Design an enzyme around this catalytic site. Sequence first.
Site, PDB file in Angstrom:
ATOM      1  N   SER A  34      18.006  16.399 -22.947  1.00 33.24           N
ATOM      2  CA  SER A  34      18.954  15.724 -22.975  1.00 33.24           C
ATOM      3  C   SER A  34      19.722  16.127 -24.274  1.00 33.24           C
ATOM      4  O   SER A  34      20.710  15.463 -24.544  1.00 33.24           O
ATOM      5  CB  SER A  34      19.495  14.422 -23.222  1.00 33.24           C
ATOM      6  N   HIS A  43      16.441  12.809 -17.542  1.00 32.85           N
ATOM      7  CA  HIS A  43      15.213  12.066 -16.270  1.00 32.85           C
ATOM      8  C   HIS A  43      16.037  12.241 -14.807  1.00 32.85           C
ATOM      9  O   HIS A  43      14.943  12.818 -13.769  1.00 32.85           O
ATOM     10  CB  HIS A  43      15.387  10.468 -16.728  1.00 32.85           C
ATOM     11  N   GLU A  57       9.013  13.194 -21.984  1.00 35.46           N
ATOM     12  CA  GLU A  57       9.914  12.985 -22.604  1.00 35.46           C
ATOM     13  C   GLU A  57      10.543  13.549 -23.606  1.00 35.46           C
ATOM     14  O   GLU A  57      11.338  14.946 -23.217  1.00 35.46           O
ATOM     15  CB  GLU A  57      10.178  11.752 -23.856  1.00 35.46           C
ATOM     16  N   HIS A 112      21.037  10.914 -21.846  1.00 39.34           N
ATOM     17  CA  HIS A 112      19.258  11.551 -21.609  1.00 39.34           C
ATOM     18  C   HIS A 112      18.547  11.252 -20.297  1.00 39.34           C
ATOM     19  O   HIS A 112      18.590  11.395 -19.256  1.00 39.34           O
ATOM     20  CB  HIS A 112      18.682  10.493 -22.605  1.00 39.34           C
TER      21      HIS A 112
HETATM   22  C1  H4B Z   1       8.029   4.510 -21.191  1.00 38.09           C
HETATM   23  C2  H4B Z   1       8.419   5.172 -22.813  1.00 38.09           C
HETATM   24  O1  H4B Z   1       8.605   3.899 -23.592  1.00 38.09           O
HETATM   25  C3  H4B Z   1      10.339   6.183 -21.981  1.00 38.09           C
HETATM   26  O2  H4B Z   1      10.483   6.469 -23.171  1.00 38.09           O
HETATM   27  C4  H4B Z   1      11.023   4.529 -21.730  1.00 38.09           C
HETATM   28  C5  H4B Z   1      11.388   3.183 -22.930  1.00 38.09           C
HETATM   29  N1  H4B Z   1      11.888   2.422 -22.306  1.00 38.09           N
HETATM   30  C6  H4B Z   1      13.418   2.467 -21.330  1.00 38.09           C
HETATM   31  N2  H4B Z   1      14.090   1.888 -21.336  1.00 38.09           N
HETATM   32  C7  H4B Z   1      15.696   2.774 -20.804  1.00 38.09           C
HETATM   33  N3  H4B Z   1      16.668   2.031 -20.115  1.00 38.09           N
HETATM   34  N4  H4B Z   1      15.369   3.995 -20.637  1.00 38.09           N
HETATM   35  C8  H4B Z   1      14.640   5.001 -20.587  1.00 38.09           C
HETATM   36  O3  H4B Z   1      14.496   5.935 -19.907  1.00 38.09           O
HETATM   37  C9  H4B Z   1      13.963   4.731 -21.065  1.00 38.09           C
HETATM   38  N5  H4B Z   1      12.490   5.642 -21.379  1.00 38.09           N
HETATM   39  N1  TIH Z   2      17.217  12.111 -28.643  1.00 31.85           N
HETATM   40  C1  TIH Z   2      17.583  11.885 -26.872  1.00 31.85           C
HETATM   41  C2  TIH Z   2      17.546  10.425 -26.186  1.00 31.85           C
HETATM   42  C3  TIH Z   2      15.973  10.183 -26.130  1.00 31.85           C
HETATM   43  C4  TIH Z   2      14.831  11.082 -25.848  1.00 31.85           C
HETATM   44  C5  TIH Z   2      13.371   9.664 -25.658  1.00 31.85           C
HETATM   45  C6  TIH Z   2      13.853   8.655 -25.672  1.00 31.85           C
HETATM   46  S1  TIH Z   2      16.077   8.555 -25.651  1.00 31.85           S
HETATM   47  C7  TIH Z   2      18.944  12.420 -26.881  1.00 31.85           C
HETATM   48  O1  TIH Z   2      19.834  12.417 -27.369  1.00 31.85           O
HETATM   49  O2  TIH Z   2      19.196  12.550 -25.731  1.00 31.85           O
HETATM   50 FE   FE2 Z   3      13.581   8.830 -21.101  1.00 27.41          FE
END
Ligand code: H4B
Ligand code: TIH
Ligand code: FE2
Lengths: 307, 307
Positions: free
Chosen positions: A232, A173, A213, A168
């Site tokens: 992802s 990202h 997201e 992910h």
């Molecule tokens: C800001 C929003 O909650 C977002 O989904 C954040 C939450 N915590 C996270 N924590 C980690 N380690 N990595 C991420 O990509 C995220 N995404």
């Molecule tokens: N559901 C996503 C992972 C996440 C999305 C948002 C926060 S974690 C995937 O399987 O790659």
């Molecule tokens: Fe994320």
Amino acid sequence: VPWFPRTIQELDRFANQILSYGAELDADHPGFKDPVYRARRKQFADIAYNYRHGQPIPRVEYMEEEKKTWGTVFKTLKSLYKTHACYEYNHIFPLLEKYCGFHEDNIPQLEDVSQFLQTCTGFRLRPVAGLLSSRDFLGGLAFRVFHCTQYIRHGSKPMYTPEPDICHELLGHVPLFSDRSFAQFSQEIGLASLGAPDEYIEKLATIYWFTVEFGLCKQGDSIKAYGAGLLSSFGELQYCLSEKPKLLPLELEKTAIQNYTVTEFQPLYYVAESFNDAKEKVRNFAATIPRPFSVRYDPYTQRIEVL
Amino acid sequence: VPWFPRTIQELDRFANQILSYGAELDADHPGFKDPVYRARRKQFADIAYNYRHGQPIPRVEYMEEEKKTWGTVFKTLKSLYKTHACYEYNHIFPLLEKYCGFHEDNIPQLEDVSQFLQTCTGFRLRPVAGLLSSRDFLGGLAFRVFHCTQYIRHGSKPMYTPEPDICHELLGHVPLFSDRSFAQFSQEIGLASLGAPDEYIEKLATIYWFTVEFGLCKQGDSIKAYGAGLLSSFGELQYCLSEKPKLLPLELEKTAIQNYTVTEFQPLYYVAESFNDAKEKVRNFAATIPRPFSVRYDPYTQRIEVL
Ligand SMILES: C[C@H](O)[C@H](O)[C@H]1CNc2nc(N)[nH]c(=O)c2N1
Ligand SMILES: N[C@@H](Cc1cccs1)C(=O)O
Ligand SMILES: [Fe+2]
Ligand SMILES: C[C@H](O)[C@H](O)[C@H]1CNc2nc(N)[nH]c(=O)c2N1
Ligand SMILES: N[C@@H](Cc1cccs1)C(=O)O
Ligand SMILES: [Fe+2]
């Protein structure tokens, strides 16, 4: 106001305060129960806990199964990106491929990835044990730091995982973080969140969720995905563009209070007029968050200045 | 336009292109002839040549004589600063003393000094074999990099040296580089010099010389020294405030074309209305340097952007 970090080194203060989406006891995701999976996650957690600002991210070795998962995820998404991923994303991916080692049979090392981002937009990675609160993750974007995980999802369900695994982070990202416009976009909303009232941070997070997201946008006479959560998961990447999901126009006054899920595919997505319009909206909203002061990050000294 | 560095790593390109003030064959400065002195300088030169962006500055050991020189220089200047150094300078010096190890019996290590500056204003040191051209030194200030020497002046004449030894760098330059206002001031004129016509760079250097190097200013009903060249030579520090030197009001249209010396005490100094007015003047002039484009340093990616 809530105490917020002033230095990029003060991130460790609130760093590694991992959380979860409560999908453990979920019979839909048996992987979490795998004792081997858990021991593995315990190992990556220790690297994150024994890590401190400055040092380079420790390189690790992955199991045969972990390489297989990445291979399946990577090769499947890469095939979907051509018709599902937005323009911005597809023109950046190749760079990671030839300059970072993003390949089907090669799980990228966070250190190399962090180095690549530094020379791109100044962003840098920071290994974390798992999910972080919206406030902490968002706050880290103010310093252009992306708290990133090293573990990979359970090989039993590579199409989707409720947790933010390495697939992910890197596939959803990292790519857009290497873009200057998106990088400055990310830092701005992160700066606005600093010391902001909790009620606005959650509204911000909800908007972040329906854009960064799982955001969807229409380029030309078509529609593509630009959200990390969609980019992802080859599972709902197919689904977000099918007819199953409900689509609605992106409107902050309505999106900010919308409900969403964290352990399954989203039943609703917001379509932006364009990737550009999406950014415009979020910024304006972010710049609307009230607070008894102003803040400015000094990239030279790496500190937050309270105006 | 002349080719200028775009990256902080491209500094090495023009880095270590050392020069001299032609004071070698000068019977006034016998030190240069000292074979021991020259061998010593050859050693520090190799560290500068074997140095490359990124690495930490190599720590070294100094001879008994070298420690003595620093001891004499340091303890003598510290006594003069109280009545000769400008306000800004005297309120910063203590910091270096307790946070950097600036002491009579302890020659500071460049690495610690560079670290101290990073957390102060973003400036960082870069070890060089000797004197650099005005264009290169000035260009380095655009990235907030200060090309600094490690060798110390010949123990025979600690009151004054025509070369920019470690005493000059640390006691005359470093202190003001830890000031934010002065730090941004230094970077701005450095940015203006980038790719600028040679004729303007030399005018700029001359102004830099009569301000940053040997500038004098009046605070209240008195007059103090704020120039690095004065702050590092207890010899002409006494002299710049005596009646011997000729004093004139700081005026760019006249200062920019004024003649000066490089192997002896200046026979003329320009007095600014205040340390602040001094900076104002230089900036305006610097912002007057014509060129077929504009430039902007990106502190995140550490590159120069050509507008
Ligand atoms: C800001 C929003 O909650 C977002 O989904 C954040 C939450 N915590 C996270 N924590 C980690 N380690 N990595 C991420 O990509 C995220 N995404
Ligand atoms: N559901 C996503 C992972 C996440 C999305 C948002 C926060 S974690 C995937 O399987 O790659
Ligand atoms: Fe994320
Ligand atoms: C810009 C102006 O010429 C100034 O005197 C520069 C020249 N070259 C230098 N070179 C080194 N290594 N250190 C300095 O302090 C200077 N000063
Ligand atoms: N003459 C100064 C050194 C320098 C001034 C200007 C360039 S080098 C001193 O002895 O410290
Ligand atoms: Fe100097």
